[PDB]
Design a protein around this ligand. Structure first.
Ligand SMILES: Cc1cc(CNC(=O)c2nn(C)c3c2CCc2cnc(Nc4ccc(N5CCN(C)CC5)cc4)nc2-3)ccn1
Ligand SMILES: Cc1cc(CNC(=O)c2nn(C)c3c2CCc2cnc(Nc4ccc(N5CCN(C)CC5)cc4)nc2-3)ccn1
Lengths: 276, 276
């Protein structure tokens, strides 16, 4: 059972509320962990116990190379500590801004990884509900590591995620499902190819308003097969989105022509394409 | 909770009694594990329940990069399955035979890793009791992964290990301790530098007989500082071996002149020296 004193804490990787992810090195092992630290007081005052509890519970059930791993938890008088894998290369968003937009080979590889992680997550009855390039981290090897499970839902209303990636049914029926993540997936693919997300406006109200009207368009040289896939994910009716249960799940989504050359079986052992 | 059907089993990595380590690939993840499989019947008939139970218990308490990790256990009607890290490069012994004997840089690096793993193991009150190059595996990155904890002892007689690495007090007092591992350590260092273990004979009786008489010698060009360290580990009185409690533990052992240039703190992140 580990304690703060077992680690040399280093730089802050991110900050929330009263919250911090800190890079830490374990003294006994020299291993690096990204340690999420949460102030018990603020969790209690903000009624966030079900959320923090859900986060720990979902991450404990996840055992897949495209997800951040929970190695350990501990707590002191003030704080909860979660020891998480450390993704050295940061946010996918960093790479989208840096190189502007991805070529076709890079879009295909990283979409396939995300599709493959979703298949696993959805197969466990878990929906992410806030999927976005900020939450899709990159490891030392440039493979994805998805994170941020505080707001996830374990299937047996309430939380709406980041505006640009919100699906119409969330704005209209207060309902969330696996197709909510598939919508975010279409927004991410568009964002990889185009360099920016599809629904953009001056404020949230205006973005929500475009989302429910399906008011976006494709730039002229958008990869034709990627556009076709995006058009089958960005569908207002959540039961007609490629990848969902009503459309027979991941098999048809993975068979999409955009993925023709993908070997789905061992993506995390394939060498990723160089980002431009 | 995993089952045989979650894996594609491949080649046999080793075989014991009615026992097998099989390389397996997990279908959901494409991850490779070395899966140890044990027949419950033979464990029961051979009265090996305390040993199998101890193995699982010791490996579960180990969390260090120089030890094989236990990721999961399961069982069916006939068999126990332990999912273990897979050390791609096999046995250190393979490398000793292949290159004949290690240069000074390679002896120093790999001894330091073993010393550093022992420090951790001994700090948890666990003694290995069968340490040998066959049990010191090499990962994809050429760092050590120590294994075979069935015969380990958790400190609060009985088991003697492989003849060539048995310490005198085991042959004389039926007593085992941390210095038993430190003796094996001196035999291993000698073996790295010389190419062969120090006590060799036609049979076990004859090897035991040399051990208790300290009947071995150094080849003429044996690294002088390595010989000095070996002479301080191969000591008949187990309370006078460098590294043991009566000699104040690992600090003096790690300060030994042979280790002058070693950075003890992050060995598993250092790039190992090329084996010749
Ligand atoms: C503080 C907080 C966060 C969250 C959601 N985020 C995380 O759990 C989370 N946030 N981060 C930043 C991480 C995680 C998971 C665990 C985790 C593991 N590895 C990394 N790697 C990493 C490395 C560098 C960056 N950078 C470089 C510095 N740059 C200016 C910003 C991004 C970001 C992430 N990051 C994380 C919710 C509430 N409070
Ligand atoms: C079957 C059995 C074993 C034991 C003690 N050994 C192990 O637990 C053990 N034995 N092996 C072979 C392993 C382990 C730990 C878990 C483990 C993880 N990685 C490897 N890697 C590996 C790869 C190749 C070889 N080779 C290449 C084939 N070569 C001809 C022999 C060695 C050996 C080990 N090996 C193992 C006790 C009772 N029954």
């Amino acid at each position: 059972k580990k304690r703060p004193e077992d680690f040399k804490f280093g730089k802050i990787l991110g900050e929330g509320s009263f919250s911090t992810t800190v890079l830490a090195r374990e003294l006994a092992t020299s291993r690096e962990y990204a340690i999420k630290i949460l102030e018990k007081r603020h969790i209690i005052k903000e009624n966030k116990v079900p959320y923090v509890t859900r986060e720990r519970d979902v991450m404990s059930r996840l055992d897949h190379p495209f997800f951040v791993k929970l190695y350990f938890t501990f707590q002191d008088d003030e704080k909860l500590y979660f020891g998480l894998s450390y993704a050295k290369n940061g946010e996918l968003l960093k790479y989208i801004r840096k190189i502007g937009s991805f070529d076709e080979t890079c879009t295909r590889f990283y979409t396939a990884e995300i599709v493959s992680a979703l298949e696993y997550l959805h197969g466990k009855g878990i929906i992410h509900r806030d999927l976005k390039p900020e939450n899709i981290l990159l490891n030392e090897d440039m493979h994805i590591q998805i994170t941020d499970f505080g707001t996830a839902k374990v299937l047996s209303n309430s939380f709406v995620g980041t505006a640009q990636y919100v699906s119409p049914e969330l704005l209209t029926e207060k309902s969330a499902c696996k197709s909510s993540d598939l919508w975010a997936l279409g927004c991410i693919i568009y964002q990889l190819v185009a360099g920016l997300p599809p629904f953009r406006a001056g404020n949230e109200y205006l973005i929500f308003q475009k989302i429910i009207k399906l008011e976006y368009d494709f730039p002229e040289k958008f990869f034709p097969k990627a556009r076709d896939l995006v058009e089958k994910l960005l569908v207002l009716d959540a039961t007609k989105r490629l990848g969902c249960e009503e459309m027979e799940g991941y098999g048809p989504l993975k068979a999409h022509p955009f993925f023709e050359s993908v070997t789905w079986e061992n993506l995390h052992q394939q060498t990723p394409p160089k980002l431009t």
